[PDB]
Structures are given as structure tokens and as C-alpha cells.
Amino acid sequence: GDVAIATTKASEHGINVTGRTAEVRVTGGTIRTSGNQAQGLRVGTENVASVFLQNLIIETSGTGALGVSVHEPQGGGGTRLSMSGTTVRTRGDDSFALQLSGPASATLNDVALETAGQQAPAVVLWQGAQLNAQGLVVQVNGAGVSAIHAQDAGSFTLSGSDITARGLEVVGIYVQEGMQGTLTGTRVTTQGDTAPALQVEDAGTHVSMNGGALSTSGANSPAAWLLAGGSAQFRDTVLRTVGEASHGVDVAAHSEVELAHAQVRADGQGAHGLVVTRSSAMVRAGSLVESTGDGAAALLESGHLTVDGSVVHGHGAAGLEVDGESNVSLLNGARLSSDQPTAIRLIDPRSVLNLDIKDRAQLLGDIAPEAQQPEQARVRVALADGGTWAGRTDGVHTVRLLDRGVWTVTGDSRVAEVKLE
Amino acid sequence: FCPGPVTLCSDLESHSTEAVLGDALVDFSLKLYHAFSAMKKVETNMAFSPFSIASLLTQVLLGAGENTKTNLESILSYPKDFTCVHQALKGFTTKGVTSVSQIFHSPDLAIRDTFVNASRTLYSSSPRVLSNNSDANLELINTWVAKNTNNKISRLLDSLPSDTRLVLLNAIYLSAKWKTTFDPKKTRMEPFHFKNSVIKVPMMNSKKYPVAHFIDQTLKAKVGQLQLSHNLSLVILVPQNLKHRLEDMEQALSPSVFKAIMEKLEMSKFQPTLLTLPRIKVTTSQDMLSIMEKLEFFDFSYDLNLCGLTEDPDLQVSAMQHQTVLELTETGVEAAAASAISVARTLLVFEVQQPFLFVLWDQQHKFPVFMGRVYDPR
């Protein structure tokens, strides 16, 4: 039941609770170890030890050093940690603020932990390692590789926390090897040089965000990157992505993004609001996708893009802009405009674009290759129950229209076929 | 006059040339690739070893006369009096790829002892002599080549001419393996785009395989470099998108372009990556005679002079053959996989889904040992 300060020389293990199956409830004070590979508050053991580190400063500093890093074996449930205040600050080549190994269990309320090392993540969670966190202000720097890094079936839930990574190749929130992350109130930020705000990739991991202004900058840095079967599902987020070569949301092979009612604004040089590659996005009740740059905002390539009750916008260069075998499907008023001619560009003339429009959609733009092409191309179109194209094509193959279908053509257009109904 | 016995140049220039030798090798590899892409069929994956062709042609040169000497010298893009090249070539000989180059001739044909001894000293081999007849001679050719390449090259040469005064021969197969073992299980069927049709092809996958990747705008291509054993690097050039046809990249490839690409690559770093790539297995037999014709060279066809090699007034290559074998799979040099304590966070995802141009490279001497292209990865 420690209550006061505990300094330390350049020697590790300022406070460790390895075994004896007890609780510490350190009330407050300060630990300022500075050894090499020293750790202020290791709690695990070689081979239940609940602690409560109430407000207290752990400003260690040393190569390989790390603040409280309780780790426990797979068996026997786990160990409980609970913090508050505790401005844990580290500065070391690989110093972790919170590394939580097998079956760990922690709950945080006002952590506000900082690091400045070389490849030092703020909180890394290994196997097991369920985490509940509020008011986190973790901010990383240096040439590291990630802020909160969740791995191998970990389960973390952040509320009202903010993550501000810095330094080149730094990821805001990196989840992979299975996860159940849930962010609510988070405002993950970032600095450029290939610094995706949120990277999720297992084909088993799943992130569910809520009103979290994922924001990047600098060189190519996907705001949200879903890889190898990852699964994001947003709720009123703001994926501002002002950065050269950036991407509002990059959904890669086997991945699936359930974006819903969230602004996804990409800005800067060649960058797409949403790049779906051999995956399946679904913008349900969304609110926007902008490009404003060189590239289009809705780049499909073998992807099942499904807008619904949202505006995909070619504000800068182009709208959908498929190049591949897409399966686009607008409905319920998807104002896929481009503030320009040629809403749905497509570089490949024969890109099999099984486009669609249903029940309220408005395609307010043209279709066009990157050149002039009179050949036969693999592009379709459909409309019904209010679907309304409002543009010129010059490049479509079949434009079959169903009941309530309204093409409302505007100018010269060579079309390989039509079917009115 | 015939060229005098070679002088073993001082070790001073033994390494003062390796730069010039590497640049000449790269230029020759580009030229020979263009010739091959000419001769072969359009959508036909091919592989060849500019290293081995260069070595065999250097053998010929050492046995060359004067006019053909100069012609082949220009073809290989060598400086005049590039003597140490011979010894220089020996320095380039790497342990990762096993080569077999040889010269056969009719027992009637006479071979100057000077050339025999010099070649034995440098190239550690001497012109084999054929039997009195030919058919059994072809049998012997095939058997010798097969048993001197660990049986990898089974049936090297078949269409041997009825009359054969002289023959060159060469064949090489890569022996180095992946410096980082690929998982077998990760191999999966995936979509490959040879044309509009999309095929399901096997491909191995690595979660965090250390690649060296970037984009060269001029050629409008993505270049990815992978590591091997024996200090070897597999460079793969893929079109930027699914639209850019590989013919486009091949034609757009120029000496300076390729040199800049390779240098910028070598200065790069091996950032982790989610890597997907199809199992590469390319075999290629081919008659060099057509290629030699299509490189402005003709002495192999007309008015061949090889005093340094023989004395026959009627001199000609009856049939010069080449064979190359490449096979890469999950058989890496070592399972480099790591444990949970890693924070790697794979950065840039790399996957080849269309016919690519691949060069295997030394990076210890900066010359392309192998070169070719893959269209049908099966």
C-alpha cells in the first residue's frame, strides 16, 4: 500500500510485484528511474496481482526502459492493473509506456502517457491483454512505428482519448492478429512520411470507431488502412486526410469497410477519398467523399463499392473513376457528382464496370476514358425506382433502363445498346 | 599473324575494370533481351543468363581472330585491350548460380595448344573433341551436359546438324534460394491478368517479407527487390496499373533508365511488406544463332575467323545452344519469421498480378546475371 515517492538510480525495476499474489495500490508520488533497460513498474513474473497506480509520475528514461509493463502467463485468468493521472513519460530507443502480455487486464482513466524513443509505441498489448481506457493523451515521436499497438486477440476500448503520433513511419492505432477494438471520442492524429492513422489487418481483426477525427498529413498516409481481411466500421467519424499521396480510406484485398455517416475528405496532391481494391466498401448513410486534388475520390478496382444515402464527390478531379472490374452500386440518393465533366472516368476502356443505380440515385456526370475510344467496352448501367443518370458517356456499352429509369442525356454519345422499360 | 598468347595482367587492373565490366554486362544484357524478345513469341515467358552468354562469347573472343574479334568486342560492349576481362570474368563467377560452358569439335578439327592451355588455366576447361560420327556425338553432348549440371539440364541439345565442324554450348541454372523462407501454407490461388481473362494461379505470401520497393515514373512502373542467398537480389518490374502492357515497359526500357533504377533501388531500404508473388519456374532452351544474327553479328554465320582457336579454312559454328533454368518456391535459405515481441507493422503492400520483367542481380558487382519476363506463372 505504498503512498509516497520512489526514485531510483541507473538500475532497473523501480517497483516490481512479481508474485506473492497481492495488491499494491500505490497512492501517488513519483518514479524517475534512468537506468538502461530499467522499468519503473514491471508487475509480472518468471512463470491476480492487482495494482492501482493512482496519480503518480513515472518519468523513466533509458534505452530499452519502459514504464509499468505487467505481463502474466496464459493460465490462471490474468492480472489486474488500474491507473489514474500518472503522466508516464519515457525517452528510450525502444521504451514502452505500457506493454501488456498474455491474459493481462488494465483499466485507465487519465493516463496521459508520452514517449520519445526510436521505435517506441505508447501502449503495446500482446496476447490476451484486454484494455479499457479513458482520457488517454498518448503522444509519440521519433522514428518509431506506432502509437497504441494491439495484437493477438487483444481487446481494447478507448473513450475520449487522443493519439498524436509523430515522426516518419508512425502509425496511430495499429491492430492486427485478431482484435476487437472500439474507439469512441478518440481523435487520433499523425504526421506524414507514411503514417497511417489507423491500420487494421488480420482478416479477423475488427475496429469499430465513433466520432473520431482520424487525421493525417505528410507523405502518403492512409487515414484508415484495412488490409488482409481487416474490418473497420465507423460511426460519425471525420477522416480528414490533407496530405500528398494520402488516401481517405484504403481498403485492400479481402478487407471490408462499413463506413456509415462520416465525412471522408481527402485533400492535397494525387490522393483518393476512398480506394477500394478487390474488397467491399459500403458507405451507408455516409455524408461525403472529396478529392479536391489530382486524383478521384472513389477509386474502385475489382471492388464492390456500395454508396447509400451519401454523396461521393469528384470535387477536385473526378467522381467514381473506376479502373478494373468494379461492381459499383448507388442507391437512395447517392449524388455521385464531380463538379466537372466526366463523373465516372475510367482509364481502361474495357474495364468491366458493372455499374448500377437504384431507387433514388443520381449520377450527375459523364463517363469517359483517358482518351477518345470508339471501340467495344465492358461497361454497363442500370436504373430503377427513381435512379437517374444525368450525363453524357461516349464510352458505355449497354445502358439498360428499368421502370422509373431516367437517363436524361445531354449531348453527343455513341452507345452500343439501350433497353428502355 | 594470329593474336599472341594472352598475358596475365597485373592484379592492379583486376579490380580497376570491374566497374567497366559491370556496365558493359548491363548494356549487353539489355541488347540481348531486346533480341530475345524479338525472336520469341509475344506472350511467352522467357529467361536467359547474360552472364553465361557473355562468358561463352568471351571464350570465343579469346579464340577469336581480328575482324570477328572487333565485331564481338563491340557486341559485348567492351573497351579495346580489355584483357583482364578474362580474369575479370572469373571474379564475377558467383556461387549462387551454377554454369557449364563448353566447346566441342570434330576429331578431324585441330585446336591450337596455346588456346587449349590458356583456356584450361583461366576457364578451367578445354575444348572437348567429338567422336568420328555425329549421332553418337549428339548423344555424348547431351549426356555430358546433363551429368555436369547435377542432371538439372536433362535434354540440352536435340536438333544437332548432320554436319558439325564446330559447336559451342552453354547452360546455367540458379542454385541460390530465398534468403527468407516463404510459408508453404500461405500459398493460395489468386487472380492473375495475362489478358482480359483472370486466372487462378498459385502464389506464396509473406506477412512482413523485407522488400525494397518504389515507383520509377519514367518507365511508369513499380520496382520491387527481394533478397536471395549467396548475395543475390531478384528485381521485379511490374506495370503501374493493370492497363500498362508489359510490352510498353519493355520497349520503354533503356540503358540509362535501367541503370538509374538499379542504383536507386540498391540505395533503398528493405521495409517490411505484405508480399504476394506467384511461384517462378522458367526454363528456356534456345538457339543463340538466330539471336546472334539479330544482333548485327554474322561471323557465326559468315566468314568466321578463329585463328586463336583453330586453323581450318572452313570455319563455322554448326549449332550454338543455350539453356537456362530458374525455380523459386517456399524453399528459403532460412525461416526468418519472428515472434510476438515484434512491432513490425508492414508498411507497403506488394503483389504482382500481371506479367512482369525480372532481373536477378549480384549487387556485389552490379551486373544482371539473369534476365527475362513472366507471363503465364504456371
Residue numbers in the entry:
A (entry chain G): 54 to 100, 108 to 481
B (entry chain A): 122 to 499
List sentences from the manuscript.
To that end, we have determined the structure of the Vag8 passenger domain in complex with the C1-INH serpin domain using single-particle cryo-electron microscopy (cryo-EM) to a resolution of 3.6 Å. A de novo model was built manually using the program COOT for the region from position 54 to 481 of Vag8. The model of the active form of the C1-INH serpin domain was placed and remodeled to fit the volume, with the only major changes in conformation being within the RCL, which is seen to be sequestered within the cleft of the Vag8 beta-barrel fold. The model for the complex reveals that C1-INH associates with the cleft within the Vag8 passenger domain beta-barrel, with two contact sites. With the exception of a mutation designed to sterically block binding of the RCL in the cleft by replacement of a small alanine side chain with a very large arginine side chain (A231R) (also data not shown), mutation of multiple residues within the cleft to alanine was required to prevent formation of the complex, emphasizing the extended nature of the interaction site. Unlike the native function of C1-INH, which results in formation of a covalent link between the RCL and the target, the inhibitor complex buries the RCL within the cleft of the bacterial protein via noncovalent interactions. Formation of a stable complex involving the RCL sterically occludes C1-INH interactions with its physiological partners.
Complement, contact activation, coagulation, and fibrinolysis are serum protein cascades that need strict regulation to maintain human health. Serum glycoprotein, a C1 inhibitor (C1-INH), is a key regulator (inhibitor) of serine proteases of all the above-mentioned pathways.
